[PDB]
Design a protein around this ligand. Structure first.
Ligand SMILES: Nc1ncnc2c1ncn2[C@H]1C[C@H](O)[C@@H](COP(=O)(O)OP(=O)(O)OP(=O)(O)O)O1
Ligand SMILES: Nc1ncnc2c1ncn2[C@H]1C[C@H](O)[C@@H](COP(=O)(O)OP(=O)(O)OP(=O)(O)O)O1
Ligand SMILES: Nc1ncnc2c1ncn2[C@H]1C[C@H](O)[C@@H](COP(=O)(O)OP(=O)(O)OP(=O)(O)O)O1
Ligand SMILES: Nc1ncnc2c1ncn2[C@H]1C[C@H](O)[C@@H](COP(=O)(O)OP(=O)(O)OP(=O)(O)O)O1
Ligand SMILES: Nc1ncnc2c1ncn2[C@H]1C[C@H](O)[C@@H](COP(=O)(O)OP(=O)(O)OP(=O)(O)O)O1
Ligand SMILES: [Mg+2]
Ligand SMILES: [Mg+2]
Ligand SMILES: [Mg+2]
Lengths: 430, 430, 225
C-alpha cells in the first residue's frame, strides 16, 4: 500500500504526523534535504575520491549533486504517473507529485555519505585488516555475525549509521523521515548468510548489528514484506535512486575519462550514437569547436533519454516491483545495454587501470593499514604513555568490544584524503 | 506588474512561452537550476576561497548551496503571500508559490560564480594592475567607461558575462530564463558615474560594456523602471537573494570562526541570545557536550528567525520596493541589528586580520600581478618565440583591444587557487 | 659556423684543406660534412619518432602506417607478428628504416659526387631521396604532438627565465667590478685582461657549459630556494 510507504514520522515521535495537517511551505521531506545540506559529514564529502584520488574531475559532492537532480526528475515523473493511476491518494490523504521527487532527491543526496576515503580501495583495506592483519587477533572474541561485518566492511551500513547515530543531547542523529530512510536502504538484510541467492538485493548487507532495532522499527512502520535472520523487500524509490546513480556514474565517468587524456573522441562519438539518435541537431553539433562542448552536449542528451527510458521501465513493472518479485535493476532491463556494457568495459580497461590510480590505491592501502593497527594497539592496553598519546591525538573525544571496533572503523572512514595523508605524514615525523 | 517580472522567454526565442502551456514536471526555472548544476564554472567553485584561502571550513560551493536553500525558503514564503494577496495570478496565468522559490534558488546558486580566486584580494589585485602596474600603458587607447571597468573589476559583471557568454555553436551560453537573470542582477547600472548617490543599488556596477545590449533587452522585457547612461530598478527577488546571502555569510562565517580556534564560545553564547531567545530548549542545549553541536544548534535557530523576520520585512514594504523608492536592504531594516553589527565587527577584528589570511592575500596579490603582466606582454607583440610559448601555454584556445583585455581578465578569473599556484610555480621553474 | 675570435684558425684550416673560395670569407662544404649531416638527420627523425611512440603521445597505428615503404622489402611478417610488446616491434621497424635510409643515402651521395666535389650541390642528401612524403609526415606529426606538449612548453619557459637571469647577473657582475655583491657573484659564477667582445663571448660560453640540473640548482640557490 502506497499510503504506508510514504511515512512522515521520525524517531522518538508519538503522534500520527498526518500529511493533511502540514504546511506546504516547508514539507517534511524538504527538511531532510535542508538537514543533510548543513550536515558535517556531507560537507566532508568535498575532499573524497570518485575515481582519481587526490581539477575539473568530479568528486563525491558533485556526483551526489548530479544524482540528487536526476533522481529527483525520475521520482517526480514516477509520482505524477502513480497519482494519475491512483486517484484516492490525492483525494483523501492529499499527496502531490513533488513529494516523490523530494523523497528521491533526499535519498540520492546522502547515498554516498559513509564511504571510506580513497574510494574503492579503502573498504578493501579495512576488510583485509581484520583478515590478513592484526585484527585477526579479535576473531575469537566476537560472534560470527559481528566478525562478518568487520571483515566485509560496507559503505551503505556506515552511511546508515552516520545518518542514525545517537549522541548525548541529540537522539536520532539527523532525525530523517522514515520514507527517506527506506528509500536510502538498498540491501535490507543482515550480513549473514553471505549471498544466499542471485537476487539484486542480497549481494551485500545494509546495516550493522548495532542498528538492527532501528531498521526493524523503520521496516515495521513502512510495511516492507518479510522474506526470511531478518530480511525485507526493496522500496521502489530505492530502485529509482539506484537507477539514477547508475546513469550518473556511467555517463559522468565516461565523459571524465574522455577529457583527461585517456580516451579518444572517436570512442565518444561511436559508442554514443543510439542514445543520442533521435534527439540531436547535426548543425549545432558541427558548429561547436572544442571537444568539451560536444561531449557535454552528448552527455546531456544521453542523460535525458536514459531518464525517460528508466521511467518507462519502472512503470512497466510496477506490480512486480511492489509485490517484491522483481529480481533485477531498471538499467539492465533497458533496450540500450550493449553500448552501456562497452562504455563500462572501456572505463575498466583504461580509466581504472591507470598507473596513477594503482599507485594512489596502494598508498591508501598502506595508510589505512597503519592507521587501523595504531588505533587497535592504542585501544587494546590503555596503560602506556605512547598509547595515551595516540588516544589523545587520534580520538580526543564505556562500551563493548564490538562497538569499540565499529566506532574505530567509523572514525577512520570519517577522515578525508588530505587529512589522512597529513596525519600519516606527521605521525611518521615527515 | 508581476505578470511581466516572471518572464519565461530565453535568448534567441520568437514565440511567447506562456506559463499555462508548459508541463509541470520540469518547469523552465528548474531547467535553469539543472543547467547551472552541470556547468563547468559551477564545478570550478569547489576550489575557490570563501574567507581562509587554501578542511571543515566552507568554500564557495557550500556557501552557494546554503544560500540556494535559504533564498528558496524566503522566495517560497514570499510567493505564497503574494498569491494570497493577488488572486488573478493563479486564476488567469496559472502561477504557483514554487515558481518564486525556484527562481530565487536558481539566482542564489550562481550569485558568486564569476568571482576571481583568492577571494577579496583578487579583484583588488586585478584593479590595481591597470592603475599602478603595466596596465596603465593601455589607458590612452581606451575610452573612459572601458577603462573604468578594468580599473574597477567586479565579480557581478564577470558572473553575468560567464552566464551570458556566446560561443560558436552555443549562442547565449547557458540560456537562462529572463526572470532568473533579472533576479541575479544586483546593480542594474553601468560603471559611470561612480557612486552618484547613497542608494543601495548604485554602489557598484553589474555589467560590462560588451554586454550592454543583452541587459537592455532583458530589462525591456522584464519591465524594470528607468531611472536615468542607462540605469534601472532592482528586482524584488534580487532583494530576497541579497537578504538570503547576507544572513548566510554573517552566520556561517561567525560559526566557522568559532570552531577554528579564533573565537571563544563565550562570545557565541553572549552575542546570540535575542536571535535564539523564544525558540530554544534549555534542556536540549545543556544536554549537548561538544561545542560544535551547540554552535550548530544556535546557527540553526538564528537562521530560522532571521528568515522569518526578513520575510516579514519584505512584506511590510512591498509597494515601496515595487515602486523603486526603497533605498535600503532588508537586513538593515530589521529589529536585530546591534548583534549583527557586533558579530561583523568581531569577525573583521579577529578573522579577517589573521596572519595566515594576510600572507595568503599577499601571495595571491603577487601571483595575479605576474600572471596579468605575462598575459599582457604576450598579447602586445605576438612576434617573439617566448610570447608564442606563453600564448600556447596560458591561452591555447580577431577582436578589439577592449575585448581582448576583458577576455584576459575573465580567463585569469577562471583559474582556481590550486591551479593558479601550480601555474605560478611551474612558470618559475619551481 | 664560427665567431670572429676564431676566424684565423678556420682560415688556416680551409687553406690547408683546399676548400673552394666562394666570396666576407666563405668556403664550400666538405663531402664528409654532407655525410655527417645525413647521418644526424636520419637519427633524430627516426629516434624522435620512436621515442614519441613509447612515451604515450603517439599510437602504434601511426607507427605501422607511416613506416611501410621504408620497411617494405626488408621485413619478415612471421617474426613481426610473433612479437608481443610494442617496444620490440618499434625497435624492429626502427632497425629496418635506419638500414634502408643508410643505403639510400650512400647511393644518393655516390650519384652526385662530381657536383658535390665541385661545390655546385645546393641541397642535402635526405631531401634528394625517394622517401620524402613519409619523412615529412613523421616530422609534422612530431611537431604537432611532441614539440607542443604542455610539459615541453613549461620547461622551455623555465629555461628561458633561468638563462635570462643568469645572463643579466653575469653582465651586471662584469660591468662594474667594484661593489661587494659583484665580487661575490664573480667568485661564485666564474672563479677561474681581454676586450669587451671576448668578455661577452666567454660569458656566453660559460653559461652554455652548465647542464640542466646544475643550472637549476644554481638558479634555486642564488634565490635562496
Ligand atoms: N530530463 C532531465 N532531467 C534532469 N536532468 C536532465 C534531463 N535531461 C538532461 N539532464 C541533464 C543533462 C543536461 O545536460 C542538463 C540540462 O538539461 P537540458 O538543458 O534540459 O538538456 P539539453 O542540453 O539537451 O537541452 P534541450 O532541451 O535544448 O535539448 O541536465
Ligand atoms: N574497480 C574499480 N576501481 C576503481 N573505481 C571503481 C571501480 N569500480 C567502480 N569504481 C568507481 C566508478 C564510480 O565512479 C564509483 C562509484 O561506484 P560505487 O557506488 O562504488 O559502485 P556500486 O554501484 O557497485 O556500489 P554499491 O553496490 O556498493 O552501492 O566507483
Ligand atoms: N526555515 C528554514 N528554512 C531553511 N533553512 C532553515 C530554516 N531554519 C533553519 N534552517 C537551516 C539551519 C538549520 O540548522 C537547518 C535545518 O533546519 P531545521 O532542522 O528545520 O531546524 P532546527 O534544527 O532548529 O529544528 P527544529 O524545528 O527542531 O527546531 O537549516
Ligand atoms: N575585508 C574582507 N577580507 C576578507 N574577507 C572578507 C572581507 N569582507 C568580506 N569578506 C568575506 C566574508 C564573506 O564570507 C565573503 C563573501 O562576501 P562578499 O559577497 O564578497 O561581500 P559583499 O556582500 O560586500 O559583496 P557584493 O556587494 O560585491 O556582492 O567575503
Ligand atoms: N647498416 C647499418 N649500419 C649501422 N647501423 C645500422 C645498420 N642497420 C641498422 N642499424 C642500426 C639499427 C639496428 O636496429 C641496429 C643493429 O643493426 P642490425 O642488427 O644489423 O639490424 P637488424 O635488426 O635489421 O638485423 P638483420 O640483419 O637480422 O635484419 O643498428
Ligand atoms: Mg553514487
Ligand atoms: Mg554569497
Ligand atoms: Mg645531432
Amino acid at each position: 500500500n502506497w499510503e504506508h510507504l510514504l511515512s512522515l514520522k521520525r524517531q522518538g515521535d508519538t503522534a500520527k504526523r498526518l500529511r493533511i495537517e502540514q504546511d506546504d511551505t516547508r514539507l517534511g521531506f524538504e527538511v531532510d534535504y535542508d538537514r543533510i545540506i548543513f550536515s558535517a559529514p556531507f560537507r566532508s564529502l568535498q575532499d573524497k575520491t570518485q575515481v582519481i584520488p587526490l581539477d575539473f574531475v568530479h568528486t563525491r559532492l558533485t556526483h551526489s549533486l548530479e544524482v540528487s537532480v536526476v533522481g529527483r526528475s525520475l521520482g517526480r515523473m514516477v509520482g505524477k504517473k502513480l497519482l494519475e493511476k491512483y486517484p484516492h491518494l490525492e483525494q483523501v490523504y492529499g499527496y502531490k507529485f513533488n513529494d516523490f521527487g523530494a523523497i528521491v532527491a533526499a535519498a540520492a543526496l546522502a547515498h554516498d555519505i559513509g564511504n571510506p576515503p580513497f574510494g574503492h580501495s579503502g573498504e578493501k583495506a579495512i576488510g583485509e585488516f581484520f583478515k590478513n592483519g592484526y585484527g585477526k587477533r579479535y576473531k575469537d572474541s566476537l560472534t560470527a555475525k559481528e566478525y562478518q561485518d568487520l571483515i566485509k566492511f560496507e559503505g551503505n551500513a556506515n552511511g546508515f549509521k552516520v545518518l542514525s547515530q545517537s549522541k548525548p543531547g541529540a537522539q536520532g542523529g539527523l532525525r530523517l523521515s522514515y520514507a527517506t530512510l527506506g528509500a536510502f536502504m538498498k540491501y535490507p538484510k543482515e550480513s549473514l548468510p553471505h549471498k544466499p541467492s542471485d537476487h539484486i538485493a542480497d549481494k551485500k548487507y545494509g546495516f550493522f548489528q548495532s542498528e538492527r532495532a532501528l531498521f526493524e522499527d523503520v521496516a515495521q512502520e513502512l510495511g516492507l514484506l518479510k522474506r526470511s535472520d531478518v530480511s525485507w523487500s526493496r522500496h521502489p524509490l530505492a530502485y529509482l535512486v539506484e537507477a539514477a546513480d547508475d546513469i550518473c556514474y556511467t555517463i559522468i565517468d565516461f565523459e571524465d575519462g574522455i577529457n583527461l587524456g585517456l580516451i579518444p573522441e572517436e570512442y565518444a562519438l561511436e559508442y554514443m550514437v543510439k542514445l543520442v539518435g533521435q534527439t540531436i541537431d547535426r548543425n549545432k553539433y558541427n558548429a561547436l569547436q572544442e571537444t568539451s562542448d560536444r561531449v557535454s552536449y552528448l552527455r546531456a542528451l544521453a542523460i535525458g533519454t536514459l531518464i525517460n527510458e528508466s521511467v518507462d521501465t519502472f512503470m512497466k513493472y510496477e506490480e512486480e516491483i511492489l509485490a517484491g518479485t522483481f529480481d533485477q535493476s531498471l538499467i539492465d532491463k533497458s533496450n540500450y545495454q550493449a553500448q552501456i556494457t562497452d562504455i563500462i568495459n572501456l572505463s575498466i580497461e583504461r580509466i581504472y587501470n591507470s598507473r596513477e590510480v594503482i599507485e594512489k590505491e596502494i598508498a591508501g592501502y598502506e595508510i589505512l593499514s597503519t592507521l587501523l593497527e595504531a588505533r587497535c594497539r592504542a585501544l587494546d592496553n590503555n596503560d602506556t604513555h605512547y598509547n595515551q598519546l595516540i588516544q589523545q591525538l587520534l580520538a580526543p573525544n564505556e562500551k563493548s568490544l564490538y562497538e569499540n571496533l565499529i566506532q574505530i572503523c567509523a572514525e577512520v572512514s570519517t577522515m578525508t584524503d588530505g587529512k589522512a595523508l597529513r596525519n600519516y605524514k606527521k605521525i611518521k615525523g615527515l
